[PDB]
Amino acid sequence: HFEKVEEILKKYGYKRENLIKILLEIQEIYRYLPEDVINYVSTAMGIPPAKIYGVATFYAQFSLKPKGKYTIMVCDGTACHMAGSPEVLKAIEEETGLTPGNVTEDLMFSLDQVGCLGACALAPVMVINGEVYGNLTADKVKEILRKIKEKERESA
Amino acid sequence: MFKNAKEFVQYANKLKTLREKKLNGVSIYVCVGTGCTAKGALKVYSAFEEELKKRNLKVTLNRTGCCGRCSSGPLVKIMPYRFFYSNVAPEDVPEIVDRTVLKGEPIERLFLTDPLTGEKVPRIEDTTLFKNQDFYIMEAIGESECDSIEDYIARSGYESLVKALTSMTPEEIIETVKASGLRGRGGGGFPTGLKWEFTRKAQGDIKFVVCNGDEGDPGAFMNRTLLERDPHLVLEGMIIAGYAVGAQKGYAYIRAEYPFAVKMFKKAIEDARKLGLLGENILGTGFSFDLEVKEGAGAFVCGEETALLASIEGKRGMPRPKPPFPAQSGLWGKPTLINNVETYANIPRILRDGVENYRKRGTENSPGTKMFSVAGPLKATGIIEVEFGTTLRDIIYNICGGFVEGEEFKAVQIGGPSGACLSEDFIDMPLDYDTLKKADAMVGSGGIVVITKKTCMVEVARFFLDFTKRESCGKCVPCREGTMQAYNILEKFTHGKATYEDLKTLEHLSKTIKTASLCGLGKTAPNPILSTLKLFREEYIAHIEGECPSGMCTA
Amino acid sequence: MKIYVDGREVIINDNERNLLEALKNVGIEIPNLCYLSEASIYGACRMCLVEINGQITTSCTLKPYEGMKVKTNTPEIYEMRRNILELILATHNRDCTTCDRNGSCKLQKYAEDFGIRKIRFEALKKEHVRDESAPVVRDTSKCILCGDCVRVCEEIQGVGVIEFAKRGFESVVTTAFDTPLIETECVLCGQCVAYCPTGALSIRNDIDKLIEALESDKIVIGMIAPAVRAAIQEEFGIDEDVAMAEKLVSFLKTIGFDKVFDVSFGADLVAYEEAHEFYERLKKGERLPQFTSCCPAWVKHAEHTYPQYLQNLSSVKSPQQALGTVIKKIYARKLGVPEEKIFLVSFMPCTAKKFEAEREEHEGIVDIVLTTRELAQLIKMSRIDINRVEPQPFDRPYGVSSQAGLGFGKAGGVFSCVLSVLNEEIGIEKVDVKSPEDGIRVAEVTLKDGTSFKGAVIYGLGKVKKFLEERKDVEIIEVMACNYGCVGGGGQPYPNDSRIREHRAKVLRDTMGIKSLLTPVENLFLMKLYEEDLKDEHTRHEILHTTYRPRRRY
Ligand SMILES: Cc1cc2nc3c(=O)[nH]c(=O)nc-3n(C[C@H](O)[C@H](O)[C@H](O)COP(=O)(O)O)c2cc1C
Ligand code: SF4
Ligand code: SF4
Ligand code: SF4
Ligand code: SF4
Ligand code: SF4
Ligand code: FES
Ligand code: FES
Ligand code: FES
Ligand SMILES: [Zn+2]
């Protein structure tokens, strides 16, 4: 009952050393790695589910929970952190109400802190669905989240 | 270019003539490297291309790699007369096009300001920042093309590979690399030639070549810049290595969170395959070599050799006790040669010239140049490149423009979490794999971060230990448990709940973690604690007393 | 080979893998927490530190060289070892009193010897996983992440249902998605438990149910497995004795057991029935090759992994279930008491028998299954000197068995018993045994009137996958999940390693040697049972036959 997964597996030939690439493509398709999909991959590739789970929980890219409609990524590299990234994290926490690695119950937001994005000159930076920011502050991020929520309320 | 070198030279000369005519004719070069696209360079490219389509104007609009001025907004260079604007916004394409493409009037507003002189220099070659840098790997700054093997060939590309394949022999390539004194730029500093020798003489008919695309530092982005700029230089270095050590397959391990670098390297592999520079036979010399891109799912530990190989095989990136080294039994037990992307980039440059010319840069023991990424509050920040005899002051002031008004130098980080923290004292000592090595520091992977007086050093050590505890693979007790315990003590420090017994516990635990950890991640995990305690012990004491000397710790 | 240890000349073996092992073989012990079982590997604990050339390194990864000078005990090494042990203990669930490994735990012994009396570090919270859904019980708060269980389950049992998950401080050995073990493809062989050096993996204890049953007015009946008697002397640190089972009978009667029967009688019954089933199958060439169904771990594994072979499974139930059904449906009637009055206790070397007793096809036959360790706990609790207990025989009519039935306790026993029954009915000319590898024995059997066949004995799950992938010329296959068979069962005394299992097999062989009944048909009580209560095919099928169903998740 998973056509795209079967296609990805066939593309890589159910080969063990392609497990990471397979998982990344599955995650792109589904936005996370659901238990049913991991079970299917284990069954098709002849790999016990525990091994795939061990791989999936080891690497930062993979997520075992659905991504938010607006996926919030805030850099926590050295430059951004010395430039106020903890303030951005706290403001996001106090506005939306979610710690890094979590998705709001309404699946509208999801937070995750990543490494240096290659934009340290704008430290601290923050990305929402691919659109980057810079020189951010607690007030600024609160404003950004408020306006995104307001826009999300004109289409209800 | 397909089955022999005569046709390759013919094709290369044709491409050189086309490139020269493009240099003469009008062209647009929009920097597309990371940092430029974070300030809206993609929108600038869309604006320029749409305007050219709407105005019906043979101008060669092109994509170029990072130009070393990431802090200067999106960057655009005009080819016939290098004007190299900066801060170009997508709301200003009509004016730039109609004043520079056709009329040719320099736009004083969009040029590059000079932090030292405070003037809008018209060209980058004339800027002091460019002049003070010693470019050897960053070539054609602002007038290069990343997404095209034709431009790289036109720029005297892969002729080093031709020379290696047809003129000189594996053993001589290795001996040349040995005498060149090229040391690993991934941070270790191990002499590359000896490593190549190890992999060559190692028993076996099948070997592998692995390029570590990882930055080795969560705050640095210079290896990513190299991959995005000239994927073909890396490709050429790796193919040369595969020929030298007699390897048939090679893997480029690049993180999946750097999509542009992965796309560029995949495209470059495809382009090299199309021309026959990769495949069942290259130049008709009987040497086959295929290269593959291995996306990384993200784990700082995978920068370690054995963990890297484990992640390439599709398993958890867990390291193992080093002996046997991967040079003898790496991927699937076959001999493997692992080098940083910078080392592979230096291979083609070294083979282009002699050892004598390559050795003129650096010091007697550290020949060549090094690429760094500079962050933190400075007038100019980004990717630089300097000779291996440069002191931190030279970089921080003459090559990066100094600090922005209201900020002063307090400390500098050189290798990120695994690197060392340096105070003002260590500023007058040239970068070198020996000077800092024995002076309790190191050049590191390349990432540099300046720390101002508004930052607390306890907070810095806490941040690095937080990173280490998150990244620890969890295999061995010292790292897995000790990094967490040390992070806990540091958090107690930053929250005003620290005593002297906590400081003694931290010092002893740091010694234990440093000595007993299985792999390099754990061994260097306490480096920030040891360095900050050596240089800024009074800050820890002040936190014990009850007041942060700076003002970022909440109490 | 000359080396210097603490400034003293030591001669070690010329060829050794690492310094630690060489010193150990020469009698010099270096503290460490890597060597914990036969499934151990070096490099994780980091406590084996030595100083060579003024630099400290792990001796488990140091190749000795002539003239090496090593300091095994320096103040620096002392501090590092104490720090590492304190690091382990700080986040360890330190509740030894209720721990299964209490008294035989290397970590507890090191804590005692290192004089750790205060946790200098902080017991920082970990997201611990507690699982009690299965007879195999998991508690990651005690796990030291040695990885022995992962290797056992993957490489030795061929299941691999437990794996390292996450990383760093949150590293944990767990099932996929922390699913309850009873809902996984775990076969409940308990080998991971047999190898675990802590209480992280333990066997579900059921002594309180037995005490409750003994205290009531219902009739408690016990039955002892063959392999229980060959191993329970280890718990008491005394030499083997072929009289162990009868001492157990005396002890159980003392603490109020009404009857104690011998499960080896059930083994005789099962072998007698299975020989006939196999002979019919051979005659009509149907449902071959035949797989033995006496090992419930193998049965569950097949239900998960080989749904095509479920019909090939022997339909005869295991000795525990067969004897228990006899007790509940025949003996209860012969005794004049309702079946609801009987509480049937089974003493087994196996964790998978606890699962089997609770299976839907067997519900309400065996009331509780206690392992050899739980029986040893009963004895120790009484403080009775078991070695001085006067033996008495098992109770009639299920207290006698042939040596072939008792042989079930070790790998190959059920196949030998089947061959014994076939020979006693349809003679066997010769048997040619062959050993393709360590745990596989292939025997060619020729009967008097032709119709020869091949049978294989496989002990240790995981060997099964490859054997079934390469041998289509066998008619009957015996599979035991645990290496060496039931003498190495998950419920056996700890430590449970190869040498101990071999010694247990020797004990069982000596116990079989003193038995005068050679084959099941020489068991007059078994013949009388068949003649009185298992005459028609319908009754025999109802009493001694069971079914199997596929196992899948969705
Ligand atoms: C945690 C960790 C991360 C590392 N990351 C990198 C890396 O990203 N790139 C790199 O070249 N070396 C990295 N190294 C060093 C490698 O172990 C190895 O020395 C290097 O890949 C060899 O390449 P070289 O010839 O350029 O020195 C890392 C080491 C550790 C312990
Ligand atoms: S030092 Fe850390 S990263 Fe390295 S093996 Fe030990 S736990 Fe893993
Ligand atoms: S495993 Fe059990 S006996 Fe050993 S130290 Fe932990 S709690 Fe105590
Ligand atoms: S009981 Fe057997 S199958 Fe289940 S986890 Fe333990 S070793 Fe694996
Ligand atoms: S459960 Fe036991 S055997 Fe498995 S890793 Fe933990 S301590 Fe080791
Ligand atoms: S071999 Fe014996 S002890 Fe092991 S699972 Fe099977 S029946 Fe139980
Ligand atoms: S540290 Fe945040 S973009 Fe570089
Ligand atoms: S990415 Fe444009 S100058 Fe660096
Ligand atoms: S014995 Fe455990 S690391 Fe050496
Ligand atoms: Zn502070």
Author numbering:
A (entry chain C): 4 to 159
B (entry chain B): 1 to 57, 70 to 567
C (entry chain A): 1 to 554
Quote from the publication:
The heterotrimeric [FeFe] hydrogenase, HydABC, from T. maritima is a soluble cytoplasmic enzyme involved in fermentation. It uses electrons from the one-electron carrier ferredoxin (E°′ ≈ −450 mV Schut and Adams, 2009), which is reduced during pyruvate metabolism, and the two-electron carrier NADH (E°′ ≈ −20 mV; Schut and Adams, 2009), produced during glucose metabolism, to reduce protons to hydrogen (E°′ ≈ −420 mV; Schut and Adams, 2009). The electron-bifurcating [FeFe] hydrogenase from Thermotoga maritima (HydABC) requires both NADH and ferredoxin to reduce protons generating hydrogen.
Following grid imaging, data collection, and processing, we obtained a 2.3-Å resolution map when D2 symmetry was enforced. The processed cryo-EM map shows that HydABC forms a dodecameric complex, Hyd(ABC)4, composed of a tetramer of HydABC heterotrimer units (from now on referred to as protomers). Oligomerization of HydABC occurs through interactions between four HydA subunits in the core of the complex. The HydA core is the best resolved part of the map, consistent with the core being rigid and homogenous.
